[PDB]
Amino acid sequence: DGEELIGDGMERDYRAIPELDAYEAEGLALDDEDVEELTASQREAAERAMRQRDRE
Amino acid sequence: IRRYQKSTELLIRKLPFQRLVREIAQDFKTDLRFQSSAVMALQEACEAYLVGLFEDTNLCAIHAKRVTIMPKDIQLARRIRGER
Amino acid sequence: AKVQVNNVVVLDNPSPFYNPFQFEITFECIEDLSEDLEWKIIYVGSAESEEYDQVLDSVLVGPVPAGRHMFVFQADAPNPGLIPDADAVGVTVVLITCTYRGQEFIRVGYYVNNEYTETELRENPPVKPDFSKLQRNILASNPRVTRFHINWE
Amino acid sequence: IQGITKPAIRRLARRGGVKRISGLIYEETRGVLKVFLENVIRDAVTYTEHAKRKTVTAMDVVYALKRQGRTLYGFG
């Protein structure tokens, strides 16, 4: 047998913790500026460079 | 008719997940920022991926007439999806 | 995705364990194909090692006209001698994989339930699995269809 | 990989439909998600470099997720 996953304490796992429940500002983008999406050429240039490692 | 009450769901906590992303991303490229929607997309990916993995583990158990799931049922779930 | 599998149908199911695998595959092609499509049928003998996977058949298809194509794939049953006893009776997987230029773009996996069709044998299964009394039941309506983004040149 | 917790693993399993878990599930789930995250991030970050950016977009991830392979239960 293993660990029971349902019963008295099911609600203990689903308690709201507003201090962890939201993303931190640090590490993220500074502003809401428009940012370029990869061109199809850079998309390919990327995927070829990634296939490089796969080989070793 | 039955009306549903609406509520956000909780799989993995957000702040810990963001710190986890930062950790890993640091090793690939230092001084690198994430858009909130990008981290969220990464989280949505992980969470649905692991939930699906467990769905396989659930189906493996019910037909095999078991109650407890094992790391081997996860290994199978991983295999049917392609990774070695 | 230049080639897209529209459907797979499981033909003799459930069946005796030793019965050959019968699938009906419908795929779609946006344009004519320069290289061949390679379809593999693989039985995962054990989740513990890739060593125990048995390639039951491999078919090469080409050249491919554009449009909806339909064919019937039939591979022989896996060798019971190579299947670790622990995994033999109970749930395992069969994979149908297709590669283009040796690159897998689609994997269709099925969970496979091996079980004795007699009550007495279910109450007390033998220490060594008896494959001739085993039913193979492919959980057909629950496939694991995984698509990978590969180079099409 | 302390980011993901034992409570988290349970939450994921419950939505998965699971009723009981072995002790070894926690250690295992962690190893699996470690690989999965390392892979998707690695690719998304390369995408960002190739676009000459230091701000990662949702599309960087969207593109990296197509690369890892997505599964659906049935055909279309």
Side-chain angles (χ1 to χ4, degrees), chain C residues 32-90:
Chain C
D32 289 13
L33 276 179
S34 61
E35 290 171 322
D36 298 329
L37 291 167
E38 192 193 331
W39 299 87
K40 288 173 166 291
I41 301 190
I42 308 159
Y43 192 100
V44 169
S46 175
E48 283 159 312
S49 178
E50 285 192 322
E51 265 207 315
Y52 307 95
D53 310 354
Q54 298 184 43
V55 180
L56 314 175
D57 213 301
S58 186
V59 157
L60 216 49
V61 167
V64 192
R68 182 177 284 255
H69 299 282
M70 195 176 292
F71 76 102
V72 172
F73 211 146
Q74 192 172 347
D76 266 350
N79 189 37
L82 286 149
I83 310 172
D85 282 7
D87 307 310
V89 199

Coordinates of all heavy atoms in Angstrom, one line a residue, chain C residues 32-90:
Chain C
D32 N 3.2 16.3 -52.9 CA 4.0 15.0 -53.2 C 5.2 14.9 -52.4 O 5.9 15.9 -52.0 CB 4.4 15.0 -54.7 CG 3.2 14.7 -55.6 OD1 2.0 14.8 -55.1 OD2 3.4 14.5 -56.8
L33 N 5.6 13.7 -52.0 CA 6.7 13.4 -51.1 C 8.0 12.9 -51.8 O 8.0 11.8 -52.5 CB 6.3 12.5 -50.0 CG 5.7 13.2 -48.7 CD1 5.4 12.1 -47.7 CD2 6.6 14.3 -48.1
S34 N 9.1 13.6 -51.6 CA 10.4 13.3 -52.2 C 11.0 12.0 -51.6 O 11.5 11.2 -52.3 CB 11.3 14.5 -52.0 OG 11.6 14.8 -50.7
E35 N 10.9 11.9 -50.3 CA 11.5 10.7 -49.6 C 10.3 9.8 -49.2 O 9.2 10.0 -49.4 CB 12.3 11.2 -48.3 CG 13.6 11.8 -48.7 CD 14.3 12.4 -47.5 OE1 13.5 13.0 -46.6 OE2 15.5 12.4 -47.4
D36 N 10.7 8.6 -48.5 CA 9.8 7.6 -48.1 C 9.3 7.9 -46.6 O 10.1 8.4 -45.8 CB 10.4 6.2 -48.2 CG 10.7 5.8 -49.6 OD1 10.0 6.3 -50.5 OD2 11.7 5.0 -49.8
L37 N 8.1 7.5 -46.3 CA 7.6 7.4 -45.0 C 7.9 6.0 -44.4 O 7.5 5.0 -45.0 CB 6.1 7.8 -44.9 CG 5.7 9.2 -45.2 CD1 4.1 9.2 -45.4 CD2 6.1 10.2 -44.1
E38 N 8.5 6.0 -43.2 CA 8.7 4.8 -42.5 C 7.8 4.6 -41.3 O 7.9 5.4 -40.3 CB 10.2 4.7 -42.1 CG 10.6 3.3 -41.6 CD 12.0 3.3 -40.9 OE1 12.8 4.2 -41.3 OE2 12.2 2.4 -40.1
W39 N 7.0 3.6 -41.3 CA 6.1 3.3 -40.2 C 6.6 2.2 -39.4 O 6.9 1.1 -39.9 CB 4.7 2.9 -40.7 CG 4.0 4.0 -41.5 CD1 4.1 4.2 -42.9 CD2 3.0 5.0 -41.0 NE1 3.3 5.3 -43.3 CE2 2.7 5.8 -42.2 CE3 2.5 5.3 -39.8 CZ2 1.8 6.9 -42.1 CZ3 1.6 6.4 -39.7 CH2 1.3 7.2 -40.8
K40 N 6.8 2.4 -38.1 CA 7.2 1.3 -37.2 C 6.1 0.9 -36.2 O 5.4 1.8 -35.7 CB 8.4 1.8 -36.4 CG 9.7 1.9 -37.1 CD 10.8 2.5 -36.3 CE 12.2 2.3 -36.8 NZ 12.6 0.9 -36.8
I41 N 5.9 -0.4 -36.0 CA 5.0 -0.9 -35.0 C 5.9 -1.5 -33.9 O 6.6 -2.5 -34.1 CB 4.0 -1.9 -35.5 CG1 3.1 -1.3 -36.6 CG2 3.2 -2.5 -34.3 CD1 2.0 -2.2 -37.0
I42 N 5.9 -0.9 -32.7 CA 6.7 -1.3 -31.6 C 6.0 -1.7 -30.3 O 5.1 -0.9 -29.9 CB 7.7 -0.1 -31.2 CG1 8.5 0.4 -32.5 CG2 8.7 -0.6 -30.1 CD1 9.1 1.8 -32.3
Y43 N 6.3 -2.8 -29.8 CA 5.7 -3.3 -28.5 C 6.7 -3.1 -27.4 O 7.8 -3.7 -27.4 CB 5.3 -4.8 -28.7 CG 4.5 -5.4 -27.6 CD1 3.1 -5.6 -27.8 CD2 5.0 -5.8 -26.4 CE1 2.3 -6.1 -26.8 CE2 4.2 -6.3 -25.4 CZ 2.8 -6.5 -25.6 OH 2.0 -7.0 -24.6
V44 N 6.3 -2.3 -26.4 CA 7.2 -2.1 -25.3 C 7.0 -3.2 -24.3 O 6.0 -3.3 -23.6 CB 6.9 -0.7 -24.6 CG1 7.6 -0.6 -23.3 CG2 7.3 0.4 -25.5
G45 N 8.0 -4.1 -24.3 CA 8.0 -5.3 -23.4 C 8.1 -4.9 -22.0 O 7.4 -5.5 -21.2
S46 N 8.9 -3.9 -21.6 CA 9.0 -3.4 -20.3 C 9.2 -1.9 -20.2 O 10.0 -1.3 -21.0 CB 10.1 -4.1 -19.5 OG 10.3 -3.5 -18.2
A47 N 8.6 -1.3 -19.2 CA 8.8 0.2 -19.0 C 10.1 0.5 -18.4 O 10.6 1.6 -18.4 CB 7.7 0.7 -18.0
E48 N 10.8 -0.6 -17.9 CA 12.1 -0.4 -17.2 C 13.3 -0.2 -18.2 O 14.2 0.5 -17.8 CB 12.4 -1.6 -16.3 CG 11.6 -1.6 -15.0 CD 11.4 -3.0 -14.4 OE1 11.0 -3.9 -15.1 OE2 11.7 -3.1 -13.2
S49 N 13.3 -0.8 -19.3 CA 14.3 -0.6 -20.3 C 13.8 -0.6 -21.8 O 12.9 -1.3 -22.1 CB 15.4 -1.6 -20.1 OG 16.5 -1.5 -21.1
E50 N 14.5 0.2 -22.6 CA 14.3 0.2 -24.0 C 14.7 -1.2 -24.7 O 14.2 -1.5 -25.7 CB 15.0 1.3 -24.7 CG 14.3 2.7 -24.5 CD 14.9 3.8 -25.3 OE1 16.1 3.8 -25.6 OE2 14.1 4.7 -25.8
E51 N 15.6 -1.8 -24.0 CA 16.1 -3.2 -24.4 C 14.9 -4.1 -24.7 O 15.1 -4.9 -25.7 CB 17.0 -3.8 -23.3 CG 18.5 -3.6 -23.6 CD 19.3 -4.7 -23.0 OE1 19.1 -5.1 -21.8 OE2 20.3 -5.2 -23.6
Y52 N 13.8 -4.0 -24.0 CA 12.7 -5.0 -24.1 C 11.7 -4.6 -25.1 O 10.7 -5.4 -25.3 CB 12.2 -5.3 -22.7 CG 13.3 -5.7 -21.8 CD1 13.9 -4.7 -20.9 CD2 13.7 -7.0 -21.7 CE1 14.9 -5.1 -20.0 CE2 14.8 -7.3 -20.9 CZ 15.3 -6.4 -20.0 OH 16.3 -6.7 -19.1
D53 N 11.8 -3.5 -25.8 CA 10.9 -3.1 -26.9 C 11.2 -3.9 -28.1 O 12.3 -4.1 -28.5 CB 11.1 -1.6 -27.2 CG 11.1 -0.7 -26.0 OD1 10.8 -1.2 -24.9 OD2 11.3 0.5 -26.2
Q54 N 10.1 -4.5 -28.7 CA 10.2 -5.3 -29.9 C 9.6 -4.6 -31.1 O 8.4 -4.3 -31.1 CB 9.5 -6.6 -29.6 CG 10.0 -7.5 -28.5 CD 9.4 -8.8 -28.4 OE1 9.1 -9.5 -29.4 NE2 9.1 -9.3 -27.2
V55 N 10.4 -4.3 -32.1 CA 9.9 -3.8 -33.4 C 9.3 -4.9 -34.1 O 9.9 -5.7 -34.8 CB 11.1 -3.2 -34.2 CG1 10.5 -2.6 -35.5 CG2 11.8 -2.1 -33.4
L56 N 7.9 -5.0 -34.1 CA 7.2 -6.1 -34.6 C 7.1 -6.1 -36.1 O 6.9 -7.1 -36.8 CB 5.7 -6.1 -34.0 CG 5.6 -5.9 -32.5 CD1 4.2 -5.8 -32.1 CD2 6.3 -7.0 -31.8
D57 N 7.2 -4.9 -36.7 CA 7.3 -4.7 -38.1 C 7.7 -3.3 -38.5 O 7.6 -2.3 -37.7 CB 5.9 -4.9 -38.8 CG 6.0 -5.5 -40.2 OD1 6.6 -4.9 -41.1 OD2 5.5 -6.7 -40.4
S58 N 8.2 -3.1 -39.7 CA 8.6 -1.8 -40.3 C 8.3 -1.7 -41.8 O 8.7 -2.6 -42.5 CB 10.1 -1.5 -40.0 OG 10.4 -0.2 -40.4
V59 N 7.6 -0.7 -42.2 CA 7.1 -0.6 -43.6 C 7.6 0.7 -44.2 O 7.5 1.8 -43.5 CB 5.6 -0.8 -43.7 CG1 5.0 -0.1 -44.9 CG2 5.2 -2.2 -43.6
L60 N 8.0 0.7 -45.4 CA 8.5 1.9 -46.1 C 7.5 2.2 -47.2 O 7.1 1.4 -48.1 CB 9.9 1.6 -46.7 CG 10.9 2.8 -46.7 CD1 11.0 3.5 -45.4 CD2 12.2 2.3 -47.2
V61 N 6.9 3.4 -47.2 CA 5.9 3.9 -48.1 C 6.4 5.1 -48.9 O 6.9 6.1 -48.4 CB 4.6 4.2 -47.4 CG1 3.6 5.0 -48.3 CG2 3.9 3.0 -46.9
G62 N 6.2 5.0 -50.3 CA 6.6 6.0 -51.2 C 6.7 5.5 -52.6 O 6.7 4.3 -52.9
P63 N 6.6 6.4 -53.6 CA 6.4 7.8 -53.4 C 4.9 8.1 -53.1 O 4.0 7.4 -53.5 CB 6.8 8.5 -54.8 CG 7.5 7.4 -55.5 CD 6.9 6.1 -55.0
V64 N 4.7 9.2 -52.4 CA 3.4 9.5 -51.9 C 2.7 10.7 -52.7 O 3.1 11.8 -52.7 CB 3.4 10.0 -50.4 CG1 2.0 10.0 -49.8 CG2 4.3 9.0 -49.6
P65 N 1.5 10.3 -53.3 CA 0.7 11.3 -54.0 C 0.1 12.3 -52.9 O -0.1 11.9 -51.8 CB -0.4 10.5 -54.6 CG 0.1 9.1 -54.7 CD 1.0 9.0 -53.5
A66 N -0.2 13.5 -53.3 CA -0.9 14.5 -52.4 C -2.3 14.0 -52.2 O -3.0 13.4 -53.1 CB -0.8 15.9 -53.0
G67 N -2.8 14.2 -51.0 CA -4.2 13.9 -50.6 C -4.3 12.8 -49.5 O -3.4 12.4 -48.9
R68 N -5.6 12.4 -49.3 CA -5.9 11.4 -48.2 C -5.7 10.0 -48.7 O -6.3 9.5 -49.6 CB -7.4 11.6 -47.8 CG -7.8 10.7 -46.7 CD -9.3 11.0 -46.3 NE -9.4 12.2 -45.5 CZ -9.6 12.3 -44.2 NH1 -9.7 11.2 -43.5 NH2 -9.7 13.5 -43.6
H69 N -4.7 9.4 -47.9 CA -4.4 8.0 -48.2 C -4.8 7.1 -47.0 O -4.8 7.6 -45.9 CB -2.9 7.9 -48.5 CG -2.5 8.6 -49.8 ND1 -2.7 8.2 -51.0 CD2 -1.9 9.9 -49.9 CE1 -2.3 9.1 -51.9 NE2 -1.7 10.1 -51.2
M70 N -5.0 5.8 -47.3 CA -5.5 4.9 -46.3 C -4.9 3.5 -46.6 O -5.0 3.0 -47.7 CB -7.1 4.8 -46.4 CG -7.8 4.2 -45.2 SD -9.6 4.3 -45.4 CE -9.9 6.0 -45.2
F71 N -4.3 2.9 -45.6 CA -3.7 1.6 -45.7 C -3.9 0.8 -44.4 O -4.1 1.3 -43.3 CB -2.2 1.6 -46.2 CG -1.3 2.1 -45.1 CD1 -0.5 1.1 -44.5 CD2 -1.1 3.4 -44.8 CE1 0.5 1.5 -43.5 CE2 -0.2 3.8 -43.8 CZ 0.6 2.9 -43.2
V72 N -3.7 -0.6 -44.5 CA -3.9 -1.5 -43.4 C -2.5 -2.1 -43.0 O -1.9 -2.8 -43.8 CB -4.9 -2.6 -43.6 CG1 -4.9 -3.6 -42.5 CG2 -6.3 -2.0 -43.8
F73 N -2.1 -1.7 -41.8 CA -0.8 -2.2 -41.2 C -1.0 -3.5 -40.4 O -1.9 -3.5 -39.5 CB -0.2 -1.1 -40.4 CG 1.3 -1.2 -40.4 CD1 2.1 0.0 -40.3 CD2 2.1 -2.4 -40.4 CE1 3.5 0.0 -40.2 CE2 3.4 -2.4 -40.4 CZ 4.1 -1.2 -40.3
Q74 N -0.3 -4.5 -40.6 CA -0.4 -5.8 -39.9 C 0.9 -6.4 -39.5 O 1.7 -6.9 -40.4 CB -1.2 -6.7 -40.8 CG -1.7 -8.0 -40.0 CD -2.7 -8.8 -40.8 OE1 -3.2 -8.4 -41.9 NE2 -3.0 -10.0 -40.4
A75 N 1.3 -6.3 -38.2 CA 2.5 -6.9 -37.7 C 2.2 -8.1 -36.8 O 1.1 -8.2 -36.3 CB 3.2 -5.8 -36.9
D76 N 3.1 -9.0 -36.8 CA 3.0 -10.2 -35.9 C 3.1 -9.9 -34.4 O 3.6 -8.8 -34.0 CB 4.0 -11.3 -36.3 CG 3.6 -12.3 -37.3 OD1 2.3 -12.4 -37.6 OD2 4.4 -13.1 -37.8
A77 N 2.5 -10.8 -33.6 CA 2.5 -10.6 -32.1 C 4.0 -10.7 -31.6 O 4.8 -11.4 -32.2 CB 1.7 -11.7 -31.5
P78 N 4.3 -10.0 -30.5 CA 5.6 -10.0 -29.9 C 6.1 -11.3 -29.4 O 5.2 -12.2 -29.2 CB 5.5 -9.0 -28.7 CG 4.1 -9.1 -28.4 CD 3.3 -9.2 -29.7
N79 N 7.4 -11.5 -29.3 CA 7.9 -12.8 -28.8 C 7.7 -12.8 -27.3 O 8.4 -12.0 -26.6 CB 9.4 -13.0 -29.2 CG 9.9 -14.4 -28.9 OD1 9.2 -15.4 -29.0 ND2 11.1 -14.4 -28.5
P80 N 6.9 -13.8 -26.8 CA 6.7 -13.9 -25.4 C 7.9 -14.2 -24.6 O 8.0 -13.9 -23.4 CB 5.6 -15.0 -25.3 CG 5.8 -15.8 -26.5 CD 6.2 -14.8 -27.6
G81 N 8.9 -14.8 -25.3 CA 10.2 -15.2 -24.7 C 11.0 -13.9 -24.2 O 11.8 -14.0 -23.3
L82 N 10.8 -12.8 -24.9 CA 11.6 -11.6 -24.7 C 10.9 -10.7 -23.7 O 11.4 -9.6 -23.3 CB 11.9 -10.9 -26.0 CG 13.0 -11.5 -26.9 CD1 12.6 -11.2 -28.3 CD2 14.3 -10.9 -26.5
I83 N 9.6 -11.0 -23.3 CA 8.8 -10.2 -22.4 C 9.0 -10.5 -20.9 O 8.7 -11.6 -20.5 CB 7.3 -10.3 -22.7 CG1 7.1 -10.1 -24.2 CG2 6.5 -9.2 -21.9 CD1 5.7 -10.3 -24.7
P84 N 9.6 -9.5 -20.1 CA 9.8 -9.8 -18.7 C 8.5 -10.2 -18.0 O 7.5 -9.5 -18.1 CB 10.3 -8.4 -18.2 CG 11.1 -7.9 -19.3 CD 10.3 -8.3 -20.5
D85 N 8.5 -11.3 -17.3 CA 7.3 -11.9 -16.8 C 6.4 -10.9 -16.0 O 5.2 -11.0 -16.1 CB 7.7 -13.1 -15.9 CG 8.1 -14.3 -16.7 OD1 8.1 -14.3 -17.9 OD2 8.3 -15.4 -16.0
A86 N 7.1 -10.0 -15.2 CA 6.4 -9.1 -14.4 C 5.3 -8.3 -15.2 O 4.2 -8.0 -14.7 CB 7.3 -8.2 -13.7
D87 N 5.7 -7.9 -16.4 CA 4.9 -7.0 -17.2 C 3.9 -7.7 -18.2 O 3.0 -7.1 -18.7 CB 5.8 -6.1 -18.0 CG 6.8 -5.4 -17.1 OD1 6.4 -4.8 -16.1 OD2 8.0 -5.4 -17.5
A88 N 4.1 -9.0 -18.4 CA 3.4 -9.8 -19.4 C 1.9 -9.7 -19.2 O 1.1 -9.3 -20.1 CB 3.9 -11.2 -19.4
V89 N 1.4 -10.1 -18.0 CA 0.0 -10.0 -17.7 C -0.3 -8.6 -17.0 O 0.3 -8.3 -16.0 CB -0.5 -11.1 -16.7 CG1 -2.0 -11.2 -16.8 CG2 0.2 -12.4 -17.1
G90 N -1.2 -7.8 -17.7 CA -1.4 -6.5 -17.2 C -1.1 -5.4 -18.3 O -0.9 -5.8 -19.4

